């Protein structure tokens, strides 16, 4: 169809990217990854990756999308048809990401529902699901006494199984919460995402205000000083392992949602001559600042918990994705009328995650319909396609909300869409653009659209800095490989690790496979075939 959509105003583009940027990756993923990696040792790789690859690649996606009015898949048909597999790899990343990203909001919805109560269940462990080993953290410091908050998170919400080999029963309450969130996502996407007028003044601003309140509460705690010292002081010895390097790298590639197709899709709606350099840098600063500021709140709470319980900071909570659900409720318990603040906090989590999810789903649909604009035209066809995609994603998320679903979630988070695949996709993007497509040609394209060249920082980052960082972490991770462990105590079965690698390979292998498919479908000799496919076709 001739029709192609565009933003009605630049504010819409800014809001869409801000909603895509700020979400569970900042307030939930960054705190637990830093806690797992030992605090300060996580930051040095983080800032290296950020100012080295993070922002330049984010500008790369937006400016590629703006240059070619196409989705994540069909954009590469004009830069490099031979390397069109990057778009397929990105969408597979998006498809896998949407399955497990929603489950966090399912946990938040369950927490939100179980906060409509006279007293918060995690304020004491006199409840049924609690073990006799429990002792109130107010008296834990006065042989393996445990906190009630951790007990609620594990026994009640997760109903944690002894291992992934024991899936157990399917949590009906989590399934209905999983369904409710997906129904919200469908009804907000089946027609089209919109700012909806003045409601943005509440949807967008509220999460930052709530985070500020949590930051004030955390820094005012008696043991905040020790937590901040652990957060900021680097452990140089930890840099001798690839874990801190890979975790910091893929976190940025995940938080910025750049290896995904959403950023290209959002850029595709921009005007050709639109100036977005300043906006991209400011939005990146907002995302990085939000994560760094939220880190202070989380670790201040953890420092207070360590001081109260008498245990070390590294041993005070879970070294896994459950850190947010163990730390933030605890801080809420230390506030007047804890029910009110818990309600606002989990509404804050839903608002941050739903806005990001809407961007991810909308980008996935936009990239997919670009392949078949006529068959997937607007109207009934799009509504059916969205309904089918949401239903399949719902059924795919159902396996990780069981008793042993936490291990499946951890496997998905580490390997699928948030691990080596981000390094794989990012390296090929910069390699094609800087070397095969031509850095000088792309700078000319950037100048034609923005009016100014990208500059030495962006050119060198695409040409050298990003490829070197991606390859180095790839080699370092593969040469010093260590297996994945849940909560640093559970060893995954060899088949579970193979499944995780297969999940990673499902996206990584898209690049070589499509290259073979593209090459084999082109007639003539090999040299002519590659020459044609390297030339912009569409």
């Amino acid at each position, epitope marked *: 169809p001739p029709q192609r959509e565009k933003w009605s105003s630049k504010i819409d583009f800014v809001l869409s990217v801000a909603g895509g940027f700020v979400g569970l990756g900042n307030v939930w993923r960054f705190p637990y990854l830093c806690y797992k990696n030992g605090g300060g040792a996580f930051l040095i790789p983080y800032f290296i990756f950020l100012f080295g690859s993070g922002l330049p690649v984010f500008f790369l996606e937006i400016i590629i999308g703006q240059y070619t009015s196409e989705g994540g898949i069909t954009c590469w048909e004009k830069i490099c048809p031979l390397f069109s597999g990057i778009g397929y790899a990105s969408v597979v990343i998006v498809s896998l990401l949407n399955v497990y990203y929603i489950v966090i909001l399912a946990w938040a919805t369950y927490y939100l529902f179980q906060s409509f109560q006279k007293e918060l269940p995690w304020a004491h462990c006199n409840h049924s699901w609690n073990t006799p080993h429990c002792m109130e953290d107010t008296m834990r410091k006065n042989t393996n006494f445990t906190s009630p908050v951790i007990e609620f998170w594990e026994r009640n919400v997760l109903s944690l199984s002894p291992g992934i080999d024991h899936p157990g029963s399917l949590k009906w309450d989590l399934a209905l919460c999983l369904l409710l969130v997906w129904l919200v996502c469908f009804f907000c996407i089946w027609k089209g995402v919109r700012s909806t007028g003045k409601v943005v003044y509440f949807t967008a601003t509220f999460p930052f205000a709530m985070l500020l309140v949590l930051l004030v509460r955390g820094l005012t705690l008696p043991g905040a000083g020790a937590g901040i010292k652990f957060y900021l002081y680097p452990d140089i010895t930890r840099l001798e392992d690839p874990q801190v390097w890979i975790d910091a790298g893929t976190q940025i590639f995940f938080s910025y949602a750049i290896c995904l197709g959403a950023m290209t899709s959002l850029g595709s709606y921009n005007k050709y001559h639109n100036n977005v350099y300043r906006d991209c840098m400011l939005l990146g600063c907002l995302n990085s600042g939000t994560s760094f500021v939220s880190g202070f709140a989380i670790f201040s709470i953890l420092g207070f918990m360590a001081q109260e319980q008498g245990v070390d900071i590294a041993d005070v909570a879970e070294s896994g994705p459950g850190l947010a659900f163990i730390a933030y409720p605890k801080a809420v318990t230390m506030m007047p009328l804890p029910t009110f603040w818990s309600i606002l906090f989990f509404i804050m989590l839903l608002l941050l995650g739903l806005d990001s999810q809407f961007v991810e789903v909308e980008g996935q649909i936009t990239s997919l319909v670009d392949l078949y604009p006529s068959f997937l035209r607007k109207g009934y066809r799009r509504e059916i396609f969205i309904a089918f995609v949401c239903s399949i994603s719902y059924l795919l998320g159902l396996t990780m909300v069981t008793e042993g679903g936490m291990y499946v979630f951890q496997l998905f988070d580490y390997y699928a869409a948030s691990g080596v695949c981000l390094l794989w996709v990012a390296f090929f993007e910069c390699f094609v653009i800087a070397w095969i497509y031509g850095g000088n040609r792309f700078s000319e394209d950037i100048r034609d659209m923005i*009016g100014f060249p990208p500059g030495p920082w962006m050119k060198y980052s695409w040409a050298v800095i990003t490829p070197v960082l991606c390859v180095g972490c790839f080699i370092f991770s593969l040469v010093k490989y260590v297996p994945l462990t849940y909560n640093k105590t559970y060893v995954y079965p060899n088949w579970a690790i193979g499944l995780g690698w297969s999940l990673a390979l499902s996206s990584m292998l898209c690049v070589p496979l499509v290259i073979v498919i593209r090459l084999c479908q082109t007639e003539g000799p090999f040299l002519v075939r590659v020459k044609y496919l390297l030339t912009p076709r569409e």
Partner: antibody
Amino acid sequence: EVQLVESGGGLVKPGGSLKLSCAASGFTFSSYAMSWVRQSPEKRLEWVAEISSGGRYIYYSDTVTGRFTISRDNARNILHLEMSSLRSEDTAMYYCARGEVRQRGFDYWGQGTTLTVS
Amino acid sequence: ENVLTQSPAIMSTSPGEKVTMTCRASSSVGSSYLHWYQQKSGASPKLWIYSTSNLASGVPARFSGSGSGTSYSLTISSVEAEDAATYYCQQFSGYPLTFGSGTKLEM
């Protein structure tokens, strides 16, 4: 350091053709966008055409879109402007400008050469 | 075409007073896409102010610029000798590029 000097100009019959040139020195000519601006005897500046930093994107004024042509010589670092049909209103002095950054404008200008019609 | 117009055709003032000049645009232009050029009476033009506030390298800074939307202006704190020249405002936001009608200071 940066210097621009134009060459080529004289009397032509109406409807004739003449090719102008612009030499560059002191900078990487293959990295900066170039534009032609002409000043009529009435002293009014009129933009003519622009060639991108690599010569892939080209823009023309509405009045010279069908008769004028802008081109580059990156190896020789010389900018060429070719006219296929010089009308009576084409008499002016043509200036070579180094308009690379649109946010900064024509920061450098050449000496200029005059063109007249009989 | 976004035709640019300057209100004063010609100006003459004593070399001890401030003067002001305006540039009106037929369409709204970004603050970063309009520049002022100073042309000596007998030589080539020269970039004077760009981005509506950034003074060029060679300007004594005795100049200043302000504006937004479709109305723009340039100002001089106190004009001295050799300041008499023709000043052109230029649109650089969209093609075709347009220069103002030109305005000349005298005496």
